[model samples]
Target chain A: RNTSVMKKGGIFSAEFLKVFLPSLLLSHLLAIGLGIYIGRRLTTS
Target chain B: RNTSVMKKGGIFSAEFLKVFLPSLLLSHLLAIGLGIYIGRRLTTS
Candidate 1:
């Protein structure tokens, strides 16, 4: 039941990300996140 | 020079996302963001 409703004290919550990301990006963010994740994993930081 | 520093008046700025996202996901959030963005794109809403 993930609706597009912003909840208080949950701006950084998982649910908020679930809602806000749609307006943000589909592939752009994915590529960026993967790059960063892989980079971090390799660097160990 | 995108360092991990939260700037003022830019909580939702691309720069902030660039910084905050590294801490948030790397995979989980990316998956969710894609799902939502694609859904909206296909539905046109």
Candidate 2:
């Protein structure tokens, strides 16, 4: 039972990371770029 | 066996899409935006 828990835990965690990291990174990048673009445009003009 | 049978069955199921699609789109958009901003900044400055 403990072995099963460990195995499933490992797999689930890996899968979660595979999904989570990319989404998190993408959201951050979008937010940042949107911020920067708006900033530059506001400042330059 | 029956409990395990219905569990973790197929990858292409709607459940999988519900879990994966949003994350995938979020990640791709982020990577592309990051590339665009960094590229633009490097080019401009």
Candidate 3:
């Protein structure tokens, strides 16, 4: 179970963020904007 | 703190992807489509 645990200041930090940041940004933008769009549509229609 | 670690090949793989794939796909499509739509609207308006 400890295999996923990275060493402090390991190279994995770079690898992890390479995948994590884009995923995070994409998910946030989509979820927020979709929520707003649906909210506005529901209110207007 | 260390509780988040996973084994190299664990049951978490199946569980993680169960949540990850749909989240990844939906987020990607929504982000791209919404960006294009907003860009078009902003340009024309």
Candidate 4:
């Protein structure tokens, strides 16, 4: 065939993820999960 | 004279960025490329 969504997605991700990604990133899932993990420790004292 | 670290750390491990900072402004990588394109399109001609 040609390219499915997942297939196209990976190719596309690499096309960009090269570095610095767009510019900024984020995080968060739950207190114990990944959700707030980045946000949690990220905003602590 | 210069900016500051504000703080330093990894994802989840911290917050504010507060948890995230650099790319917090935009959502996607293209946003940056798009932003530049837009900037030029508006300023240049």
Question: Which prediction has the highest TM-score against the true structure?
Answer: 2
> Over the stretch A1-45, how does candidate 3's per-residue lDDT look in tens digits?
556975655442343345566657856687656655654554452
Candidate 1 Cα misplacement greater than 4 A, ranges: A1-8, A12-20, A23-25, A28-45, B1-11, B23-25, B28-45
Root-mean-square deviation per candidate: 13.0, 11.3, 13.3, 17.8
Better of 3 and 4 by lDDT: 3
Candidate 1 lDDT over A1-45, as tens digits, reads 457675555454453366556644555556655655554554454
lDDT of each: 0.55, 0.59, 0.57, 0.37
Candidate 3 stretches with Cα past 4 Å from truth are A1-23, A26-45, B1-15
Sort by DockQ, top down from the best: 2, 1, 3, 4
Residues B1-45, candidate 2: write the lDDT tens digits: 445545432333566557777866776566666655665675586
Candidate 1 is graded, for docking, as: incorrect
TM-score of each: 0.22, 0.36, 0.35, 0.22
What DockQ was computed for model 3? Answer: 0.06
Worst 10 residues of 3 chain B by lDDT: B6-15
